[PDB]
RNA sequence: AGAUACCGUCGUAGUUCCGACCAUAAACGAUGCCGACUGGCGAUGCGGCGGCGUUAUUCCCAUGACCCGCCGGGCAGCUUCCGGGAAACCAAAGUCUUUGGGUUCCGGGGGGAGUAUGGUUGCAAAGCUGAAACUUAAAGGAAUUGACGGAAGGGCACCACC
């Protein structure tokens, strides 16, 4: 990630970041998130510096591939925007996904049948998934989170400055990490791109679910 | 045991505010303590508002409203059921009740 | 710990937070042992060893666990000094 | 007002250590302060510090390590004999292994063990461990 | 202590000399009122003449007639 | 007060998630399936349970119900879970970029590209909601 | 017994004592 | 009879993969199965009931009493724990508190008073703990001095391996619940107090959960 | 039941002003003052600095009125595992057995008692100063679970009513 020209963000990625709108952050700002913002434009919207978003994106990918067994890395999402992105992240890497309704006590209660003991927990949103982050304190559990300019950084052990509001954006970095986590360990060649399309991770509105059907019928 | 942080009144930097009289009783309550209620009502609600309309020589005549500012004491505001006791953590919330009708 | 004879006498030596240099206690269940993987530059694959760190539960609970990890990555050259 | 200047300096760098700051700024710089910081620096309890000497009472920026438990100041500056110096470090220092009582003597400002070697006491300034 | 001046000895000492009187045990030991009111007068024992045998009642649910003498 | 207890509701969901094809919609036939696919000790429970599975059918053809696993409609979900359009929602040459963003890109080496169209900054700071 | 009426009752008694004592001077 | 593990940490200690209990402390891993401790320290480790406290709650029909058991536990060398359990039956509370006491044993750092000859006898520093209002202090003492303290924390200190120590208690020490918790908090701070000895940079050993990551997919879930 | 009370009708002193006294209030933030340090966040008042645009004089610059920020201190608020606290709670009630920035006042179980007495101030009412004998094993603080409420909100019963 550090001055190694193989791992610098290439031109096709930035066109994905601009089209998906990941550089556009929230209206207000967290005092912890001033490290990753370029400047607050007029109309009161901050700009997340993508170059500093790319460096954290790789840094997060270093931690995952460092974990030997790809199963014991929980990937969670409670907001409707992230479930579809995290089941195909955990299917592409080999992680165990958690889609919605994180029942409190899946990390600290043994008698539970849903008792999981992961080594690393990556989250879509610190606010929406505030519960599992707390359980990440009762057990020694490093944490990753697709943070926004407003998201708090309590118990977050490494953050990815992103826009976790738009569906087109959330699925993108679940598609972004998917490439790098499979590019560190030999799965994909970095020369020709990934065959998996970033639209696959996007969250589909039930409205657009049945609005494209007659476009196919 | 201190119940409210603001002592149940809006006085923060004054030391003394002028009192007002309650509307039901004549109780002297500090102006920032009294439960104030500002009511905007027509002089006629539903039974009269119709048959007054055609009885008016001026047709399409907007009926005037009645502007009254009520000042209740804590005892009267409670007995009149304008405010009611809340749980310890529901006390802290100070947004007015929802307004839809 | 030593004695005058020159003997290590404690039963175990505790860890120390890689950011605040505070001893991570035996019951600090909010501490982490994160492992950052390095990458050979030319081919860009996973080499095999790590760049392990250790964060105490306190700064995590405070909010500088991600900023500390970032500064440690810069000190070891994992994150580009340009950043 | 600001009566004791060494007290404001120590309490600030003691507060900033509990919070975990990397380097702290202290507003007034006095001759006794820089002489006090060197006694702590020569034992490894603090890092490299710097004096921003303007045309007024200068400011000091002290690089902090994680090695300082507490650096208190004893006020007022009591007189210490060599007979009662053991009784001070008996109820002021954590243990007999580490910790130092900084006290000024006619020979200068040094810890309590150097005051044992030079065999002269003096007024007590503070303590750090 | 509140004032930690280097030469506030007469201020500290006069304070304790003053505040000591608010200690109930100390105030009775350093005033004649407790010693004059004592029928013994600081003596551990005393001889007297019994002049009648009176029975004293008990107070709380512990009920009985305690046998005493008026010396 | 005809409210079904859990032991009626619990057993009524289990057969539907296991015999969704054999049971039907009218009360009487899927009443007859229940004594064969579940040993019920009483006759009223046989009708109580059968009475609820009939009610759950006209909830199933109207859409999915939350707690159930019907091997037909979660595959309706799965085929909607891997749909991929012919073109990307990223493949735009019409990416409206604002005048203040590209200097951040100009602050990078990806400063001047081809398919980026600059917009105009809407003048007049107006983004906060009115207080109170 | 309010602490205010004991202060009023004791002021009425303390005032009555000032008179019974004054008529002897 | 025999034990089957539930926690992935408990899997390894039944496979003799984990050498001792200290490498669990070194990574601050939460032990959540009591049979991990009796595997390492299960013979020389002794128990001690401190006091049976009959708390009560009021109901519309009399008082509902349930007994509270304070158990101090630990071998008389380096380790000590303290469990408290409240059950309706006294026998059930004592048996239950022993289980919690083992899940909370912590290593005590024993030090020297002045001359570092022989084996450590006393506390390394002036450490103090506090629970509620009780504030108990621990002062290093010379050899052959004994534990100078009240009978209540004396047992916790004798079960910790410390043989010489001065103490000073402030607050309502009549509440054994806080007066026993307080000393346990002080004893727990011996390995959290930074000493100029513990200044060398930590060479990080690889976690036992990672160093045995292949043994966790080979035989079980 | 009685009401020398609550309720109602009158109504004196007073309530108002001027000039002298009085010096007490739950005179309360029940929280001495001065100084330093230790998280954010959105507002707000005054002054200053900067900045697109909008609107007023109109004839623009400059001034107003908005709009976006920054600085100082001011009343506050929200938030939090700063830390503290018996807890309620507190960015101070924190930096306290790791105990010492400076300095005033002031407390030592409950009563007796802010009483007696002496002194002093005042026209008086009273204020300030201020004991003891004797009595007593508790008084008290915060919080919990119950019971209770001529407290509130939902619901129920012909051993309740309609």
From Swiss-Prot, chain C:
Modified residues (N-acetylmethionine): 1
InterPro entries: Ribosomal_eS21, Ribosomal_eS21_CS, Ribosomal_eS21_sf
Alphabetized UniProt keyword annotations: Acetylation, Cytoplasm, Endoplasmic reticulum, Isopeptide bond, Ribonucleoprotein, Ribosomal protein, Ubl conjugation
GO biological process: translation
Subcellular localization: Cytoplasm, Cytosol; Cytoplasm; Rough endoplasmic reticulum
One GO MF term: structural constituent of ribosome
Positions bearing the Glycyl lysine isopeptide (Lys-Gly) (interchain with G-Cter in SUMO2) cross-link: 41
Annotated Gene Ontology cellular component terms: cytosolic ribosome; ribonucleoprotein complex; rough endoplasmic reticulum
Coarse class of the protein's main subcellular location: cytoplasm
Pfam families found in the cross-reference section: Ribosomal_S21e
Biological function: Component of the small ribosomal subunit. The ribosome is a large ribonucleoprotein complex responsible for the synthesis of proteins in the cell.
Subunit field text: Component of the 40S small ribosomal subunit.
Recorded family membership: Belongs to the eukaryotic ribosomal protein eS21 family.
Protein name per Swiss-Prot or TrEMBL: Small ribosomal subunit protein eS21
Organism listed in the record: Oryctolagus cuniculus
Lineage of producing organism: Eukaryota, Metazoa, Chordata, Craniata, Vertebrata
Underlying gene: RPS21
UniProtKB/Swiss-Prot annotation, chain D:
GO cellular component terms, semicolon-separated: cytosolic ribosome; nucleolus; ribonucleoprotein complex
Compartment(s) of residence: Cytoplasm; Nucleus, Nucleolus
Gene Ontology biological process terms, A to Z: translation
Quaternary context: Component of the 40S ribosomal subunit. Part of the small subunit (SSU) processome, composed of more than 70 proteins and the RNA chaperone small nucleolar RNA (snoRNA) U3.
HAMAP family xref list: Ribosomal_uS8_A (MF_01302_A)
Function text: Component of the small ribosomal subunit. Part of the small subunit (SSU) processome, first precursor of the small eukaryotic ribosomal subunit. During the assembly of the SSU processome in the nucleolus, many ribosome biogenesis factors, an RNA chaperone and ribosomal proteins associate with the nascent pre-rRNA and work in concert to generate RNA folding, modifications, rearrangements and cleavage as well as targeted degradation of pre-ribosomal RNA by the RNA exosome. Required for proper erythropoiesis.
Protein name per UniProt: Small ribosomal subunit protein uS8
From Swiss-Prot, chain E:
Residues recorded with modification 3-hydroxyproline: 61
Record location of the Glycyl lysine isopeptide (Lys-Gly) (interchain with G-Cter in SUMO2) cross-link: 36
Organism the protein comes from: Oryctolagus cuniculus
Domain of life: Eukaryota
Region (Disordered): 1-25
Family the entry assigns: Belongs to the universal ribosomal protein uS12 family.
Localization of this protein: Cytoplasm, Cytosol; Cytoplasm; Rough endoplasmic reticulum; Nucleus, Nucleolus
Function: Component of the ribosome, a large ribonucleoprotein complex responsible for the synthesis of proteins in the cell. The small ribosomal subunit (SSU) binds messenger RNAs (mRNAs) and translates the encoded message by selecting cognate aminoacyl-transfer RNA (tRNA) molecules. The large subunit (LSU) contains the ribosomal catalytic site termed the peptidyl transferase center (PTC), which catalyzes the formation of peptide bonds, thereby polymerizing the amino acids delivered by tRNAs into a polypeptide chain.
Post-translational modifications reported in the UniProt record: Hydroxylation at Pro-61 affects translation termination efficiency.
Gene this protein is translated from: RPS23
Oligomer and partners: Component of the 40S small ribosomal subunit. Part of the small subunit (SSU) processome, composed of more than 70 proteins and the RNA chaperone small nucleolar RNA (snoRNA) U3.
Name of the featured protein: Small ribosomal subunit protein uS12
Biased composition (Basic residues): 1-19
Chain positions with N6-succinyllysine modification: 53
Curated annotation (Swiss-Prot), chain H:
Organism: Bos taurus (Bovine)
Residues bearing PTM Phosphothreonine: 195, 213
Major localization listed first in the record, in broad terms: cytoplasm
Entry comment on modification after translation: Citrullinated by PADI4 in the Arg/Gly-rich region. Asymmetric arginine dimethylation by PRMT3 occurs at multiple sites in the Arg/Gly-rich region.
Protein's cellular compartments: Cytoplasm; Nucleus, Nucleolus
Family from the record: Belongs to the universal ribosomal protein uS5 family.
Record PTM Phosphoserine, positions in chain: 207
Biological role: Component of the ribosome, a large ribonucleoprotein complex responsible for the synthesis of proteins in the cell. The small ribosomal subunit (SSU) binds messenger RNAs (mRNAs) and translates the encoded message by selecting cognate aminoacyl-transfer RNA (tRNA) molecules. The large subunit (LSU) contains the ribosomal catalytic site termed the peptidyl transferase center (PTC), which catalyzes the formation of peptide bonds, thereby polymerizing the amino acids delivered by tRNAs into a polypeptide chain.
Cellular component per GO, a single term: cytosolic small ribosomal subunit
Glycyl lysine isopeptide (Lys-Gly) (interchain with G-Cter in ubiquitin) cross-link, chain position(s): 1, 218
Record carries keyword DNA-binding: no
Subunit organization: Component of the small ribosomal subunit. Interacts with zinc finger protein ZNF277 (via zinc-finger domains); the interaction is direct; the interaction is extra-ribosomal. Interaction with ZNF277 competes with the binding of RPS2 to protein arginine methyltransferase PRMT3.
GO MF term (any one): RNA binding
Location of the S5 DRBM domain: 45-108
Name of the protein described by the UniProt record: Small ribosomal subunit protein uS5
Residues of the full protein shown: 58 to 278 of 293
